[PDB]
Amino acid sequence: GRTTRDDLINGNSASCADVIFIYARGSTETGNLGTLGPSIASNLESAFGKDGVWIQGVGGAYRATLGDNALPRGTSSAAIREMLGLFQQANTKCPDATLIAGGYSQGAALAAASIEDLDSAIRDKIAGTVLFGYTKNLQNRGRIPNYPADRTKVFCNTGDLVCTGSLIVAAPHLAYGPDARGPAPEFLIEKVRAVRG
Numbered sequence: 001g002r003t004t005r006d007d008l009i010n011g012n013s014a015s016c017a018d019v020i021f022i023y024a025r026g027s028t029e030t031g032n033l034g035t036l037g038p039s040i041a042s043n044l045e046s047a048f049g050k051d052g053v054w055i056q057g058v059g060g061a062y063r064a065t066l067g068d069n070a071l072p073r074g075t076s077s078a079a080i081r082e083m084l085g086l087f088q089q090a091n092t093k094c095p096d097a098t099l100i101a102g103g104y105s106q107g108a109a110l111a112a113a114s115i116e117d118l119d120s121a122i123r124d125k126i127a128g129t130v131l132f133g134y135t136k137n138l139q140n141r142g143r144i145p146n147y148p149a150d151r152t153k154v155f156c157n158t159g160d161l162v163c164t165g166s167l168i169v170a171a172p173h174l175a176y177g178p179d180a181r182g183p184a185p186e187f188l189i190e191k192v193r194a195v196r197g
Contacts, residue, residue, distance in 0.1 A: 001038050003031030007054035008090055016094035017054040019044070019192055022086050024058040024079075024107030026133070027066040032057025034064075036104050036132055036180040043185035044100075054097075056090070058083045064106055069167050074109030074135045083114035091122045098196055100188045101129040104176065105162065108134040116145040123147065128191030130184040131155065132176040138165040153187045155179040 008020055021044055025034030033041065041055040062079040073080070090099055103111035108131035115123060129144060132155045144152055156163035157172035
């Protein structure tokens with residue numbers, strides 16, 4: 001439900017959760033989780049328990065500006081610094097936690113760029129990443145640079161024009177709710193369990 005979550009920033013250091021989820025919303029979306037993030041979060045909480053997972057939206061300098069989709073990596077340098085900084089804070093504050101990540105639309109571009117640029121030692125702790133309406137899907141050949149295919153799950157609907165090289169929004173781009181409630185959190189949980197047991 002809640003469209004702003006700062007569980008990593010707020011969370012008591014000596015009480016770190018075993019799993020930390022960092023999620024970037026789409027352009028012009030509310031809070032730091034937007035439309036899809038809270039659905040993924042509630043499903044992660046069902047699986048791990050409320051105290052078993054920390055939900056952290058990408059807020060701060062990530063303004064989710066529509067025009068920033070036109071920048072080279074589909075988001076701004078300031079946004080990338082913000083999301084990089086949250087991965088870094090997760091790994092610093094909670095070194096034993098398994099990380100998971102996601103993003104929608106610009107937030108998918110942001111997740112991909114941040115993961116590309118992240119220290120490999122920290123990137124290895126990201127067990128899985130889900131991307132919805134990935135604006136750099138065609139350009140990046142369905143991948144996140146420097147990150148394995150088996151840890152990536154891309155949800156790109158037929159007729160979602162952002163997945164085939166443009167920035168036009170059509171109805172399929174607004175139809176990721178079912179994925180966010182089901183297959184996306186399921187994938188993330190499977191990836192976490194494959195590493196933690």
